[PDB]
Symmetry: D2
Subunit: 494 residues, 4 copies
């Protein structure tokens, strides 16, 4: 069941959030924010730039100082604060879900039941870790007492994208804060609004000032100032491969800050003849079309064994043909728009490449409507490995389906990409499930399912799909700095 906001959303928070107060931009400049389903302005927002990032970094540094309230509070109280934020987000769930849908072009049903839930669940997960982050005592050679501290790193700059604005903000802040760090978050220029509202809830929960700062703004302005900043200790980023490379170079040129990246993919599924066919069709379908194709882990190469390939394709087309396009707020609407003009153009251009390069068009294949950055859900069959639609992350509702006969051949083809975020394997054979999943060069491999992401599991890429892991026990590693303390003693005993 699914409830709605009984009143019309009114936008309130549109300023830069530093030391728990609302600032105008140093420049006085502001920037517009649109609804992608209508192409209308929703409001203006203060535009942050290097000067404003330099302010937020100073605030974050200050909040991190030895002796400060964020450093001296019990770790269990950092956990409490996060737990409270989660309760507050749950309180304003209608709201947040509506603003997410409206600003992000995200179906309200998903915004409410999935994104909002994932934020809340992820925060509570991270809250639980806070007083469970532990170092070691170590039986070193010689007469010494050695222990390690898993300290927070320091000031972490976090640049996040427009496809899951709330989920991504919580993926970034939840771990960073649980570990004791301070943060300067730069949301996507497209979608600053849910993050500014969450800033209001950070202040209301009671986080010390300067622990979380949020600086709306553009990428090459505000984002670049984060990646090149001499007093930011770590940057985390989700988005394009292009920018991931810039961020990394910038970090090398500046202060050798720590860098973690998540950068999308061209994730493959391998469907064996023995697979439960309908389950495979369903998961691969939802796997590529979710949020209009705008998932890093979109199942954008589906390799099906020859003998079921035609049945797979036909069932996939039947399912793709059942969508209702329109405004993500209206019940029964099952596909929203793409986020903006740039993505719209890229998607249409890649669809054209597919027609031109000889792929078989099964359905969709062009735009839709008079306003909104809508794209008809599109299926291509008989796709081959050198076509643009097989190589490049599309990030639109465009499904590629391809055949294989040889199992060693298809694993090489699945692995033959600089991407490596995720993969899917559909089979009833125990041995093949284990061996295939071992052999795939991907950070997450699903067996007989797809797109299952949980707070308890580390998530990240092999190869150019990123470095590091987020969430799970393992993800917390990227938000600590280990210090070894070795103390001379007269005589050690085991």
């Amino acid at each position: 069941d699914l409830p709605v906001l009984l009143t019309d959303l009114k936008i309130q928070y549109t300023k830069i959030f530093i030391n728990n107060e609302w600032h105008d931009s140093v420049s006085g400049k502001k920037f517009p924010v649109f609804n992608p389903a209508t192409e209308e302005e929703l409001c203006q927002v203060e535009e942050g730039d290097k000067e404003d990032v330099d302010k937020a970094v100073k605030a974050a540094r200050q909040a991190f100082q030895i002796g400060s309230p964020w450093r001296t509070m019990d770790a269990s109280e950092r956990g409490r604060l996060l737990y409270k934020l989660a309760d507050l987000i749950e309180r304003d769930r209608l709201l947040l879900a509506t603003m997410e849908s409206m600003n992000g072009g995200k179906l309200y049903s998903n915004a409410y039941l999935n994104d909002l839930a994932g934020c809340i669940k992820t925060l509570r997960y991270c809250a639980g870790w806070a007083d469970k982050i532990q170092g070691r005592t170590i039986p070193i050679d010689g007469n010494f007492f050695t222990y390690t501290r898993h300290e927070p790193i320091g000031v972490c700059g976090q640049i996040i994208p427009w496809n899951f604005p709330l989920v991504m903000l919580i993926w970034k802040i939840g771990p960073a804060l649980s570990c004791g760090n301070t943060v300067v978050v730069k949301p996507a220029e497209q979608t600053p609004l849910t993050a500014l509202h969450v800033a209001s809830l950070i202040k209301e929960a009671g986080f010390p000032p300067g622990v979380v700062n949020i600086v709306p703004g553009y990428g090459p302005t505000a984002g670049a100032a984060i990646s090149s900043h001499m007093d930011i200790d770590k940057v985390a980023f989700t988005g394009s491969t292009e920018v991931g490379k810039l961020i990394k170079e910038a970090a090398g040129k500046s202060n050798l800050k720590r860098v973690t990246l998540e950068l999308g993919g061209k994730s493959p599924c391998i469907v064996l003849a023995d697979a439960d066919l309908d389950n495979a069709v369903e998961f691969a379908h939802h796997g590529v079309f979710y949020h209009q194709g705008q998932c890093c882990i979109a199942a954008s190469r589906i390799f099906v064994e020859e003998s079921i390939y035609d049945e797979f394709v036909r069932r996939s087309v039947e399912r793709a043909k059942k969508y209702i396009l329109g405004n993500p707020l209206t019940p029964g609407v099952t596909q929203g728009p793409q986020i903006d003009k740039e993505q719209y153009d890229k998607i249409l251009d890649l669809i054209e490449s597919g027609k031109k390069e000889g792929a078989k068009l099964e359905c969709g294949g062009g735009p839709w409507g008079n306003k909104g950055y809508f794209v008809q859900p599109t299926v291509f069959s008989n796709v081959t490995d050198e076509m643009r639609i097989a190589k490049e992350e599309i990030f639109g509702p465009v499904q590629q389906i391809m055949k294989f006969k040889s199992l060693d051949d298809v694993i090489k083809r699945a692995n033959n990409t600089f991407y490596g975020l995720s993969a899917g394997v559909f089979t009833k054979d125990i041995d093949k499930a284990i061996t295939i999943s071992s052999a795939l060069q991907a950070g997450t491999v699903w067996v007989n399912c797809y797109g299952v992401v949980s707070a308890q599991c580390p998530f990240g890429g092999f190869k150019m799909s990123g470095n590091g892991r987020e969430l799970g026990e393992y993800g917390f590693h990227e938000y600590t700095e280990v210090k070894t303390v070795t103390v001379k003693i007269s005589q050690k005993n085991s």
Copy 2:
């Protein structure tokens, strides 16, 4: 006790080591290798360059392929292989120690009793981990079985320096191999020889071909080809901040490979009035002069509380004045040369800056001898925080001593550097030992000792002194890639 080689060292291995065979350089070119204590050529060595690195990467990739002997062997057998290599290195300890001393300008006493021991101990430590690297089973939300694999990453390029050629080679290969990776090692152009001999012992132990490849050569040639290579998954590096930055940028520009760095420091000691004074003098002394100052963790800023500062300085000068310079092979010689002309020039130039900038010269202060890159052991007192000798890693036998009265002031001064590899605290106060060590922004902090490094402890920098950690349990994290496998099931139970 200390034994020696009964015969004169004869050099045998001077070629590139790829797929367990000895190759000449693609170019035919060779490069000379010197003894730093005499400035004489010891031999020529094949000079590897991009072409040769492209060969070694192909070999490493091949050895890493699914189904290969290195991927399918039991993890306990990877451990055995490392254990055997350690026994072989122990067998050829006289030898190795002699070649290390002769090529590296390292006192034979240290080469034998410390470096060689650290290599052997470190290898056995790493051998033990091999079948103890484990993933997780994870109680994810929903009806799924989720587990993680901590796989090896893949082909790791490892560029190492000239100050601890053997120890560094083992620090790099020991973990990488224990975790299951393959490697392409580029030793320092100055000191390839002990590494080629170890390659002979890798072949003799039985490592599959292509698991370890060693490509002697220069930095901007062979080293750069590693850092920019499109099929190397990870690079590890110890050396200069300058190159660390290049390596990182290169990795960003190329294939976003994983990068870990160790980059030296300007490590501080803080000596409180209550410290056991003689213990502090001794450890800080050995801490800065070890291996002619050529330690990443050299104790190159010693802050002493005013009331014991003069006694500290006088005792430090008395100890510095007791060295015998000369050839590192001769018993009773207690200081060898610096590695090469570049380091010699840098050290003399920094000493001059100290005289010029007003520091107080207590002893030494210029070169020594008719041949060899020798520098008299030098002590400067009344040094201040803006002088070059207080800011820049010297990497020579040059000790800085400075005073403090204010404890909060001295921690800010100790932290006021882009470095952060290590620090030392000397006090009898329990509270101060814990609070000071917590407040110092350094990767290792010693209390009432200095320079204690063990295989069981993670080791690495805060800030520009590096990223990542080596050794200990924690260090193994940087040589694995985590994959999450999530399997759909009918019904889960706790």
Copy 3:
């Protein structure tokens, strides 16, 4: 600040709690419950016996069955349920604290500010673990996939004592439930009431029926039926050494169930001449007198170095002489009664042994008041190691102080006991703090403090003070059963 219940406590829950419903005893029998400060009946409570325990075990077994709601729910939802229970306990904190004080003879100030807080903090701690309990994937020899499950054990019987009725109930259920077990709790015959109220809050939070069952009753009746029961998988117990031994034998005779025990102690402090004297006096004082001496970790042997021994004793007597005895509900009252007649008799009898055996009486030494099981706070100096008051856990407000000159001698004396729950070390010497704490045969050692117990730390005894550990990461180990699953595969890869 300290608030109170605005209305007079009315007792409501007095029945056996099985499958979330309230049962009368099979026998029809009931038993009285007293206030120890007045010796008046507070109510009658259903008296559970073997028959009633057999009912609760059947219910717990049923709730544990594969496919049941408690086994299939997400681990994160077990965490939620515990978190909710913690919020409910916080809601009824006035209440609970009042009933704890009234039934338990516990100062209301402590009941409210310490016990109630510890319950809430401990529950939230345990809630956080629930979805963070993880098994392993293991690189076994041969072509196998091996993983482990850290399953709940099953039905856990938990017998708890009268000194910290609420804290102990939460220490027991929090971990057991977080790990996924079901429980049959037998509270102390003296103090069933706060636990029955918590049962009401378990039902209200939404725990599936049969997950927590609470059977008030006597030790040799209901407690013995738990320890000898053929379908209880684990028993946990806090209380007397005598019963700990019976429980263990019973477990051996019956079904070899798992057993963990916490059994008090005769915990020593060692105060060195260099110790901060006032801090030592204060912590050792509060350490032995807390809750009328009725702490398992009471600091009931204080060894002070000769040269400060007289000053220590005098300051200790000054502090002991400042208590106000009376009803634990009245503000400014700083010592309540002992729990019951048995403890009262034991304490007076041991005090008499101290007078008789030649100890020096500094203050107190007999009973107090016309009603209530009150004992004057008593200090004995010049106590020696063979006197009853040095050997036997008193569990009353009776402080022993003794001298030492020899440090090796005093560690042997501190260790010379079959107990080993905890110890205290007071010194400013870093080396002595580490070496002494290493050498003491005790489960928790405090340095320069005493009595610091936190949810994040494992807690339990060496030697006859118990087996196993509670709380911390480590404590969760005792509430899981590890299963190894080993799956044959065609070919493994690292």
Copy 4:
């Protein structure tokens, strides 16, 4: 390939081993040791009793004292010592294997290729852990530094059985010693000889005296003195349920020492219609007949789905009919004797119960030969759940095969036993493999294999099959005692 001892085994070590020296029994008494294949005396051995155990405990206590060589040596050197012992055992492998075969009635092929290998592999595994056992640093509430030490426990008494005398000795000592404990081992009265030889190799490796003591002798004499001893901190035991219960009661009555038990089982296999039939037959066959049925994890209930049940039975009988009985030293001999008269009688008596109770005799069913405790390999089909051969651990070469139609029914039947050491599941269905293995109440579950035991995996029972786990990472937990140290500090920082 399989080598043999070129000379006739001569027995040398036959005395009690305390403080690395050979002692006669206090009583002067000696006891005989037999070969089970001939019923001839091999030698006499000193008979240890309470007095001798009291000697070994004093020696172990002494070697454990703070300041002793075993407590102060580096953990890495404990690892070295174990590694050396493993090399020595490998050196004397011919030997040891021959004595194991001759004394134990174990096929020499298995003794050499399996037992001896498992000992060596297990020791090297445990050697690797020694300096990797680590405590924690813990972010406790309040201004404290808290860390934990995972100390050795102390003196561990280890009573081991006659079926795997060498493997069991190494399973016990390897972990105990790696963790830093001292031990008093009581081998089986039947099979002391390989353990005394290993004692000689312990002395030769260089273990400090008193670290390992070995006291041959009887169960109710020497074994009971261990279990009831007031200065033994822990007992570990593998053998009968009967004695496991006595040991536990004894531990409760005496000093509440820690107890771990492994106690055999009645382990079930479940073979589904879709299973690879020949693989299932093979593994279940070897699974019950290994070492003449004398495995704790013998697959002694095989449930086969009706539709393949007859084919399963026929193939199982064909395989059972191919054994050659005789002397375990002669090549091509594939079944040795049972260990002694007691086991021989029990096995024949249980076989008779099977005939009498209506089971179907497929082959074997009585004794063999003129000397030796030989039993013909016996197969029973149509066995039902209430027959003695379905309920009681036989520990002889007697295979039970039974049918099922209902999958929920067969899991209840498999679980319907107080045992729970291990189980086997044979299926090609992924879902069933996971769900069945989850639902089985057994410590190890194999899928599509059986009897796979490795040093890297924890091993132990659910229910009356034991408590605790041996080996793996997890097994080390049972050989440490955790101490929490909590230090007061002026101000903590994260």
